[PDB]
Amino acid sequence: DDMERIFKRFDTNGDGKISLSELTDALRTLGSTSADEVQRMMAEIDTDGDGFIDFNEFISFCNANPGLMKDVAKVF
Amino acid sequence: DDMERIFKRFDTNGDGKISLSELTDALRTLGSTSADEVQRMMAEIDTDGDGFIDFNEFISFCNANPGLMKDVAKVF
Ligand SMILES: [Ca+2]
Ligand SMILES: [Ca+2]
Ligand SMILES: [Ca+2]
Ligand SMILES: [Ca+2]
C-alpha cells in the first residue's frame, strides 16, 4: 500500500487531490534529501555499479520511466 | 532532445557521467523549482485538466514509472 501512503504524504489536507501548492511543497522535500538518500537513488539507476550514472544508464532509466522526460523534466 | 540536454545540464564537470555530488545538485534544483515550472509538470500528470492530481491520475503515473516511485520512496 506504499503508493497510497505516498499519495497521502503529498495530499496535505487529505481532500483526495494533490494541488499545485501541495505538489510544489512535496518537491521541496525531495530536494532536501540526505546524502544517504541520494546514495540510495544512485544505487537504483547505477546498473553497472561504478558509482556514477552514465548516458546508457540514464537512457535505460528514462525508457523504463517515461514520466521522467515527459512530466518531471518539464520542470527544468 | 531534452534527454541529452538534461543529462548535460547536470553533468557539471562534463566527463560524461553523473556523480553523487552532481545527482545531489540535480535533486536540489528540482527542489527549488518555481510553482510556474511545477505547473508544467502538474499539467502533464493532470489528465482531466481540473488543476489537481487525483489519486487515479497519481496511480497511473506511479504504474508507468516504477523507477521514479522507488526514488520517491527513498524520501516519502
Ligand atoms: Ca489536497
Ligand atoms: Ca554506472
Ligand atoms: Ca560528471
Ligand atoms: Ca485532475
UniProtKB/Swiss-Prot annotation, chains A, B:
Specifically expressed in pollen. One of its GO terms (molecular function) is calcium ion binding. It comes from the Eukaryota. InterPro entries: EF-hand-dom_pair, EF_Hand_1_Ca_BS, EF_hand_dom, EF_hand_pair_protein_CML-like. Pfam families: EF-hand_7 (PF13499). Ca(2+) 2 binds at D46, D48, D50, E57. Keywords: Allergen, Calcium, Metal-binding, Repeat. Ca(2+) 1 binds at D11, N13, D15, K17, E22. Residues 1-33, 33-68 form the EF-hand domain. SMART domains: EFh. May be involved in the regulation of pollen-tube growth. Monomer. This is Polcalcin Phl p 7. It comes from Phleum pratense. The gene is P7.
